[PDB]
């Protein structure tokens, strides 16, 4: 069970995916120091101050995750727990970035920050599997990263769109695509609620995990599969993936300073 990946990209590009790689990285750290503050700290008004600076920590975490390997080539032979996916995502209808694809498994990350020269022992992880209170849809949330929608990836708590949430299903209407029982059963399950975590899923249609989930491609069964064919059909948005790339800095090291007022407040 190896986590490998060599780096392919220019000079160039190999500082430039450091640098985008430790900033999610901080994110991902703001998420896990929330959770902390969430866990150790009991007041009502306190709760909902520490969800969402939370739930932003998850959107930079997320938005950050979407602008790795933007050229789609930086990496090879990106191995998670001894699975290439490089080979994997290759024969996928649609292609796409190897890294981002290990990105959205659980430390994926390990594979890319070897690709980084990024000391293992500093724990530089990112994930982007949050589920219970992730402010988007979560297989939306773990697809938008998969196809790198830097573009789709909302920056912010107030900025999250109802139809990338609670009201999902308005996205998927929205493009004709076709679905199958299985995902028509599953999307059942999720109208009644949307954050329903996938072995629930998975155990009320007597299917497994995988079978529930599908490949994160247009041309499979499943939640995965389903939004894959919706965000394929989404245009790329230049300009506002610029907003959220210059803009998320400045956010980060905002959500930072409240953090760091939350913690010797409560530490």
């Given at each position: 069970?190896?986590?490998?990946?060599?780096?392919?990209?220019s000079?160039?590009?190999?500082?430039?995916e450091?640098?985008?790689?430790?900033?999610?990285?901080?994110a991902?750290?703001?998420?896990?120091?929330?959770?902390?503050?969430?866990?150790r700290?009991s007041?009502?008004?306190?709760?909902?101050?520490?969800?969402?600076?939370?739930?932003?920590?998850?959107?930079?975490?997320?938005?950050y995750?979407?602008s790795?390997?933007?050229?789609?080539?930086?990496?090879?032979?990106?191995?998670?727990?001894?699975?290439?996916?490089?080979?994997?995502?290759?024969?996928?209808?649609?292609?796409?970035?190897?890294?981002?694809?290990?990105?959205?498994?659980?430390?994926?990350?390990?594979?890319?920050?070897?690709?980084?020269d990024?000391?293992?022992?500093?724990?530089?992880?990112?994930?982007?599997?949050?589920?219970?209170?992730?402010?988007?849809?979560?297989?939306?949330?773990?697809?938008?990263?998969?196809?790198?929608?830097?573009?789709?990836?909302?920056?912010?708590?107030?900025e999250?769109?109802?139809?990338?949430?609670?009201?999902?299903?308005?996205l998927i209407?929205?493009?004709?695509?076709?679905?199958?029982?299985?995902?028509?059963?599953?999307?059942?399950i999720?109208?009644?609620?949307?954050?329903?975590?996938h072995?629930?899923?998975?155990?009320?249609?007597?299917?497994?995990?995988?079978?529930?989930?599908?490949?994160?491609?247009?041309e499979?069964?499943?939640?995965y599969?389903?939004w894959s064919?919706?965000?394929?059909?989404?245009?790329?948005?230049?300009?506002?993936?610029?907003?959220?790339?210059?803009?998320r800095?400045?956010?980060?090291?905002?959500?930072?300073?409240?953090?760091?007022?939350?913690?010797?407040?409560?530490?």
């Amino acid at each position: 069970l190896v986590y490998d990946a060599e780096f392919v990209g220019s000079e160039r590009e190999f500082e430039e995916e450091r640098e985008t790689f430790l900033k999610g990285v901080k994110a991902y750290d703001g998420v896990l120091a929330t959770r902390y503050l969430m866990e150790r700290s009991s007041s009502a008004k306190n709760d909902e101050e520490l969800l969402e600076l939370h739930q932003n920590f998850i959107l930079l975490t997320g938005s950050y995750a979407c602008s790795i390997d933007p050229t789609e080539d930086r990496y090879q032979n990106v191995i998670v727990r001894g699975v290439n996916f490089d080979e994997r995502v290759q024969r996928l209808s649609t292609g796409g970035s190897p890294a981002r694809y290990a990105i959205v498994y659980r430390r994926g990350w390990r594979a890319i920050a070897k690709a980084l020269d990024i000391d293992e022992e500093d724990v530089p992880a990112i994930e982007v599997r949050a589920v219970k209170r992730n402010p988007l849809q979560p297989a939306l949330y773990r697809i938008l990263v998969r196809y790198g929608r830097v573009d789709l990836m909302p920056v912010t708590v107030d900025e999250v769109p109802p139809e990338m949430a609670g009201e999902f299903e308005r996205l998927i209407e929205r493009y004709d695509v076709p679905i199958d029982e299985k995902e028509e059963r599953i999307l059942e399950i999720l109208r009644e609620n949307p954050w329903t975590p996938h072995d629930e899923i998975a155990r009320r249609l007597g299917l497994s995990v995988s079978e529930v989930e599908g490949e994160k491609d247009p041309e499979s069964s499943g939640i995965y599969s389903l939004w894959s064919r919706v965000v394929v059909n989404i245009e790329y948005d230049e300009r506002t993936a610029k907003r959220h790339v210059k803009r998320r800095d400045r956010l980060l090291e905002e959500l930072y300073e409240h953090l760091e007022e939350l913690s010797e407040r409560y530490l």
